[PDB]
Every structure is written in structure tokens, then in C-alpha cells.
Design a protein around this ligand. Structure first.
Ligand code: W9Z
Length: 289
């Protein structure tokens, strides 16, 4: 049972903005539409009816850890961009951890979308999806918000095929455990194959290490969702990157686009482009298609 007296009254006042009454929300616990480490995602509907995705946090059973997760993710309510996933609200209730309510994404996550063989997205489709991610990440960087887990699996597609940068703030979790590894300095599960080299070394995350991840994500798009470095063990990813080695050019990636990737992986964080700069580069490349 989550007691709001246990919640920092500081937290109560930010949460209050977005709370959803339990009678305003219907959840179908028999309809799992996603699986994370903190809980499952269910089909819900929010009241004037709205189809939505209900993220459970019930795996987080400690009130203090629940309170810290809310504290860190609540700023989410303050963001608004067509390429960034929005928060519909938070449903506190009678027993168990809070439910987080997000818009329903009709086409699921981006990686599964492009791996689907009937979809068979063209090079131009894929580059366009990449442009959309660049714009959402441009917005988040302007807010000084570091994502720390950008990857194709962590972006969603709505009914209009608009890409939403997702898996951040209150929607943060690990939604595919295969790509998180404890073989890093922290000892905790991390997406080591999407991480900038200095992140693996110093354990720090910046907008510049997001740029690095965006490069890997571009690579994923052009390979239609192939796993990065299938041949590099999680034990070797750091030294591999130290030796100057990088993901290879995808068969159907335009030479100009590969150049952008290499840039995102420059060893000197300050030498890598900004997202504002990436939106320009990639737009011009898309336009020449
Ligand atoms: C709140 C949850 C969510 C949101 C909307 C959904 N709409 C429809 C269906 C499921 C949904 C799940 C969410 N928020 N950010 C993210 C980022 C990635 C993923 C994910 C799930 N599986 N895989 C392979 C990736 N989920 N995710």
C-alpha cells in the first residue's frame, strides 16, 4: 500500500498534477502487450474513452524505491514533442504500486516493426524513422535531459507511424532482457553495446553519449533490426572500441549516412555532432531520396 505521507510531500505535489482516479481507468490484466523488469504492460482505457497502455510497477515492492522512481521520472509531464512519448497520468490505488498510463502505440516498438518481413520497409522509410528520432532527441537535449538507453527497441510507433522516443522517465524499464549485461564496472544490467566508450570507462552518461547510441540506432534501422556486434562478447566491447573498431557499413546504407554514424562514434565526445546538427544532416540526406 502506497501512502502519500510516505511519499515526500515534495513528490506529492508533482504527482498530484497527473493522478488518475481508479474509476477513470479500466485495465485488462488478461491482456499483456509488453513485458518489462518492473512489471508488465496491459491494455487499458481511460475516461470520453481513450485507449491506452498501462505500465505496472508492482515488481518494485519497496516504497522508497517506488518513491525514487517517481521522483526521477515525473519531469516527464513537463515535456511535449510529437517525437517524444507523453505521460497520460498516474493511478494510485488501494493495494500495490502505482500504475503509469501512457498513450497506446498501435505499431509497437520500432525494432520489431522493421524486422517484420511483410512490412519490408524501404531505405527511405527507415531513414525517415531515423530523422524522427533525431528530432525527438533534439528536443530532449534542449531540456538537458539525458536518455541513457536510446535504441530501436526503445522507440515506439503510433497509429500515424509517428516515432516516439520512449523508455524514459516513468516508462523506463528493460523491455528486452537479452541486451542488458552485468559485465561492466557498475555490476548492474546495462545496454553495453549501445554505450559510448567513455560511458563504459567512467560510467558517466551525457547527451554526447546519447549521440553515440543514436548512431547505433541508425545502424539498426539500416540493417532492419540486426543485433549490433553479434561477434563481440560483452566481455570485449570496451577494448574492441578502444582498438578503433566500429560497426560496419550496412549493405543498404547510403555512404553519406554511414559517415554520420562514424561521427557519432568519435572517441572524443566533443567531436561528435549535436542532435540539432544531426537533424540537418539527415534531413538533407532524406531529401536526396
Ligand atoms: C509503457 C511501455 C509501452 C507503451 C505503449 C505500448 N503500446 C502498445 C504495446 C506496448 C506498449 C508498451 C513502454 N514505454 N516505453 C517503451 C519502450 C519500449 C517498449 C517495448 C516493449 N516491448 N519491447 C520489445 C519494447 N515499451 N515501452
Amino acid at each position: 500500500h502506497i501512502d502519500l505521507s510516505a511519499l515526500n510531500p515534495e513528490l506529492v505535489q508533482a504527482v498530484q498534477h497527473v493522478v488518475i482516479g481508479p474509476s477513470s481507468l479500466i485495465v485488462h490484466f488478461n491482456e499483456v502487450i509488453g513485458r518489462g523488469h518492473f512489471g508488465c504492460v496491459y491494455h487499458g482505457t481511460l475516461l470520453k474513452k481513450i485507449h491506452c497502455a498501462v505500465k505496472s510497477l508492482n515488481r518494485i515492492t519497496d516504497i522508497g524505491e517506488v518513491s525514487q522512481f517517481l521522483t526521477e521520472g515525473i519531469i516527464m509531464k513537463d515535456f511535449s514533442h510529437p517525437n517524444v512519448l507523453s505521460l497520460l497520468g498516474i493511478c494510485l490505488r488501494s493495494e500495490g504500486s502505482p500504475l503509469v498510463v501512457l498513450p497506446y502505440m498501435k505499431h509497437g516498438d520500432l525494432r520489431n516493426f522493421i524486422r517484420n518481413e511483410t512490412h519490408n520497409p524501404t531505405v527511405k522509410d527507415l531513414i525517415g524513422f531515423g530523422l524522427q528520432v533525431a528530432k525527438g532527441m533534439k528536443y530532449l537535449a534542449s531540456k538537458k535531459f539525458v536518455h541513457r538507453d536510446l535504441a530501436a527497441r526503445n522507440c515506439m510507433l503510433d497509429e500515424k507511424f509517428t516515432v516516439k522516443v520512449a523508455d524514459f522517465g516513468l516508462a523506463r524499464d528493460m523491455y528486452d532482457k537479452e541486451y542488458y549485461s552485468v559485465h561492466n564496472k557498475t555490476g548492474a544490467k546495462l545496454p553495453v553495446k549501445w554505450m559510448a566508450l567513455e560511458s563504459l570507462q567512467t560510467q558517466k552518461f551525457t547527451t554526447k553519449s546519447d549521440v553515440w547510441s543514436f548512431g547505433v540506432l541508425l545502424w539498426e534501422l539500416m540493417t532492419r533490426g540486426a543485433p549490433p556486434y553479434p561477434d563481440v562478447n560483452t566481455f570485449d566491447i570496451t577494448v574492441y572500441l578502444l582498438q578503433g573498431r566500429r560497426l560496419l557499413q550496412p549493405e543498404y546504407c547510403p555512404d553519406p549516412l554511414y559517415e554520420v554514424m562514424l561521427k557519432c562514434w568519435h572517441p572524443k565526445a566533443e567531436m561528435r555532432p549535436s542532435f540539432s546538427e544531426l537533424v540537418s544532416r539527415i534531413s538533407a540526406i532524406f531529401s536526396t531520396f
